Amino acid sequence: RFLKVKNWETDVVLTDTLHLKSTLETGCTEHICMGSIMLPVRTKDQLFPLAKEFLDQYYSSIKRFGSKAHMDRLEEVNKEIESTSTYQLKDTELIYGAKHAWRNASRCVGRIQWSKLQVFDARDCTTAHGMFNYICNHVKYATNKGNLRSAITIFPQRTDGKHDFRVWNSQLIRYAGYKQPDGSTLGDPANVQFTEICIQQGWKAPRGRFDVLPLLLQANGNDPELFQIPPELVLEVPIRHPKFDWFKDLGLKWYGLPAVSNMLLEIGGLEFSACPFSGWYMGTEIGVRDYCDNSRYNILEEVAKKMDLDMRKTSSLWKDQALVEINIAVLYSFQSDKVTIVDHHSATESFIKHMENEYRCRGGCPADWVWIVPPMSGSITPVFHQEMLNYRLTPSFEYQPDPWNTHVWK
Amino acid sequence: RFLKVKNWETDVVLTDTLHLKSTLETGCTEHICMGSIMLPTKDQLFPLAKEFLDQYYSSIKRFGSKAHMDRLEEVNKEIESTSTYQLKDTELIYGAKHAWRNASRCVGRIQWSKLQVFDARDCTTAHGMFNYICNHVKYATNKGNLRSAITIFPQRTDGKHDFRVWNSQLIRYAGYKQPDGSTLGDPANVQFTEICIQQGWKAPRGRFDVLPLLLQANGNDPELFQIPPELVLEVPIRHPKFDWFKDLGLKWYGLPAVSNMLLEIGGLEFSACPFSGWYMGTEIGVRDYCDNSRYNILEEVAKKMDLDMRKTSSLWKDQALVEINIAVLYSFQSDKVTIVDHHSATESFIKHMENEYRCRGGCPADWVWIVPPMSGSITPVFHQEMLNYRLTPSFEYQPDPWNTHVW
Ligand code: HEM
Ligand code: HEM
Ligand SMILES: N=C(NCCC[C@@H](NC(=O)[C@H](N)Cc1ccccc1)C(N)=O)NN(O)O
Ligand SMILES: N=C(NCCC[C@@H](NC(=O)[C@H](N)Cc1ccccc1)C(N)=O)NN(O)O
Ligand SMILES: C[C@H](O)[C@H](O)[C@H]1CNc2nc(N)[nH]c(=O)c2N1
Ligand SMILES: C[C@H](O)[C@H](O)[C@H]1CNc2nc(N)[nH]c(=O)c2N1
Ligand SMILES: OC[C@@H](O)[C@@H](O)[C@H](O)[C@H](O)CO
Ligand SMILES: [Zn+2]
């Protein structure tokens, strides 16, 4: 069944056949759509078919489907699974897998960049200190003095479910959040629970507004250990405005490297529970969401005041006006400091080109419109006008519960 | 079977059971989500009629009453005999109000119970329709203090005697493709504008020319009518700070009145049911003025504001977008014409959803359409999970008549 997808601004119509290979569920039924819902030990039984699908996908990508190399590998894996209950991916398969997980991530607008991912194989890691070392090397490589390079570090896969490797942080670099007795919050409210766990584990918090959190690392299912990322490795950007000299006095700054560290990478049935990856930021992630969400730094009012905007009525659009200036400030500061960043106009335009390319070369591109459309100026970006089909392909990045909710303390 | 909907900004969680009463398909499947897609017999009739009547008597606390039973049998016999039936005025009004209540793409539903319903089922000709429409426009405009209303023309019979308003909205501006290759006026109505031209209309060939009504009664060919200028309220757009703004020569009409949809109540289809409420600012300021396929005025505005348009990263489109929307709102308020900003409208909708969840067990809502076209995350609905499903009575899309009419 071929599915048509139309762009209501250019009338360009695309055809999707890729969805035919979708196996996983979406959350929607023929009677209800859960399109805006945030969150809608494998058995030997279920492991081999998953492995075979992956290996077939892999051998077809390298144009060796049906070869002797292909048939031997399938037999070798089948035997390995029966023999040990799991199997080990070859390096080439791991790289291909990690890249495809990114190519298949429907909530990511930065996928035009997928084939350029540097994969660091950390499957030989055994302890938390080992993890810390791999993580530092990843941050130094990815940061590259501001000329950001996409990367992913893959730690040992899940075995029995009791020896998991986990990065307890949500991103390798994030600011601490502290709830005050008066009910106010100091720092980033989004990380309050994690910050408490860190203090409980021994972290001596400086209790400021932009304290970089320590890494809390779990190796082989053992209790997590704290480590401080070397300051010289953490690139930060002071935020100032090109026309408003008082902006710098707001005392805002942000880290240059976004590094998701809480997702699960699934490849050929195998599960990598610690797979920190990094790219670069789209400005609105910082300027709209991190600074302006009511539940985050929530600076719209303070900025609105300094701009002396009419804040007596919402119809003056004082929030919208201030929102734009803060976003101008974020982009301006990063570019001035020569730290990679992409604005939402550029990122979305590139995503449409990526999508058209994918439809022609791959038969499709799963995309979640709810997440792809930027949180500000939605309709003045081309993605707003683009119909998109969302479905799940593997390899993939999946959510997993926060580790503190499932860990058995020793 | 019981679904939960969470608001990630307030952590408030609501349970939805209303969806279990849904009957129509969404377009999605367990394998693919089509949530961002724009356009996803007597034996058929009675079950539909029964479902409706049952909901109706339940709403008036007479479920299982003799009146209920009696009515069900009357309609039943009427269908058997006539192959259709007629709604009591009370049912017509209830249905229209609920069609609005169930419109998942409408952010203005907190107002659903205040809908003035005009029964035009006795209409027979295009002149008759024109009269009803003029009365609707005057009533709803109310000198600027807009009042929601819908006018319901005769229901479908054999599909060969259908009433249709060919316009997309009762009031819209013409669009013409010029020699230059460019488009003059509103590009979205270029085609219809041509059907009016070809039909006989004399276009002033301007940038904001109110189009003529093209009315179809009982399947006959449509006829043209000029809406009395005095009945079309318009707002000249100026900025509370940029005196040059007025020189852009922009204006819009105060009354948004969707006229091409189909109203379905108890299996009965009303193909001509124009309705009107009032505008949410962004509909004009963001979509009509700034879509690249619409008036597309961003550059011009940015230029007059004299900002660097060399690089997208200076966010000049965004800066200008905001000013343009400040201008629309300021103007309507200045002229005392009802209008609502996206912040207030979205705040209302969250209140409405809460009312609906506790009083009805839920609220179908299409997130893709509910979240405003600008400043998405600073409005509350962005952070609100929403379940979309189809409940009836409802407003449905239908083909443009010029693609089905046999002249
Ligand atoms: C090259 C720069 C990249 C840009 C500009 C980009 C941009 C984005 C943005 C804007 C989002 C939404 C984030 C949010 O709203 O919280 C996102 C999500 C995502 N991206 Fe990318 N991304 C890039 C690289 C990557 C890389 C390196 C990977 C994996 C190898 C990746 C995987 C994902 C995933 C799985 C999501 C969903 C995260 C979630 O659900 O919280 N992205 N990306
Ligand atoms: C009282 C003020 C009202 C406000 C502020 C409001 C606002 C809106 C807005 C912003 C949209 C999106 C329009 C678009 O993007 O094209 C919408 C759609 C819609 N509204 Fe409302 N609305 C109001 C009254 C009404 C009334 C009285 C009805 C019907 C009785 C109604 C039926 C619907 C329907 C069916 C749609 C979807 C239209 C489509 O699919 O093109 N609305 N409304
Ligand atoms: N630019 C990015 N952006 C991805 C950032 C993803 C960002 N996501 C979030 O913070 C999501 N809110 C996590 C979430 C999802 C669903 C339900 C609850 C919570 C994070 N991990 O920091 N990445 N790279 O690699 O460049
Ligand atoms: N404020 C409103 N807004 C409703 C405006 C609805 C508006 N809708 C539209 O213009 C839709 N984009 C038409 C469409 C739908 C799907 C595919 C293609 C085209 C119209 N009819 O003018 N209504 N009242 O009554 O207050
Ligand atoms: C409820 C709704 O799904 C939720 O607020 C989504 C909307 N779109 C988003 N889009 C992106 N990129 N990131 C988010 O966190 C969200 N949050
Ligand atoms: C492709 C996508 O569905 C389309 O552009 C939708 C997005 N959201 C919208 N939302 C509203 N209110 N109105 C629209 O016309 C649209 N267009
Ligand atoms: O403070 C803990 C939170 O940061 C954590 O629960 C995140 O919300 C989660 O990891 C998603 O990023
Ligand atoms: Zn769906």
Swiss-Prot record, chain A:
Q: Where does L-arginine bind?
A: Q171, W280, Y281, E285
PTM note: Ubiquitinated; mediated by STUB1/CHIP in the presence of Hsp70 and Hsp40 (in vitro).
Q: Where does heme b bind?
A: C108, Y399
Q: Where in the cell is it found?
A: Cell membrane, Sarcolemma; Cell projection, Dendritic spine
Residue sites binding (6R)-L-erythro-5,6,7,8-tetrahydrobiopterin per the record: S36, V370, W371, F384
Expression by tissue, per the entry, reads: Isoform N-NOS-1 is expressed in brain and colorectum. Found in the Auerbach's plexus of the enteric nervous system. Isoform PNNOS is expressed in the penis, urethra, prostate, and skeletal muscle, and coexists with the cerebellar nnos in the pelvic plexus, bladder and liver, and is detectable in the cerebellum.
**Which domain of life does the UniProt lineage start with?**
Eukaryota
* Outcome after substituting Y281H: 50% decrease of nitric-oxide synthase activity
Q: Which family does it belong to?
A: Belongs to the NOS family.
**Self-association or partners: how does it assemble?**
Homodimer. Interacts with DLG4 (via N-terminal tandem pair of PDZ domains); the interaction possibly being prevented by the association between NOS1 and CAPON. Forms a ternary complex with CAPON and RASD1. Forms a ternary complex with CAPON and SYN1. Interacts with ZDHHC23. Interacts with NOSIP; which may impair its synaptic location. Interacts with HTR4. Interacts with SLC6A4. Interacts with VAC14.
What is stated about domains?
Answer: The PDZ domain participates in protein-protein interaction, and is responsible for targeting nNos to synaptic membranes. Mediates interaction with VAC14.
Task performed by this protein: Produces nitric oxide (NO) which is a messenger molecule with diverse functions throughout the body. In the brain and peripheral nervous system, NO displays many properties of a neurotransmitter. Inhibitory transmitter for non-adrenergic and non-cholinergic nerves in the colorectum. Probably has nitrosylase activity and mediates cysteine S-nitrosylation of cytoplasmic target proteins such SRR. Inhibitory transmitter for non-adrenergic and non-cholinergic nerves in the colorectum.
> Mind telling me what this protein is named?
Nitric oxide synthase 1
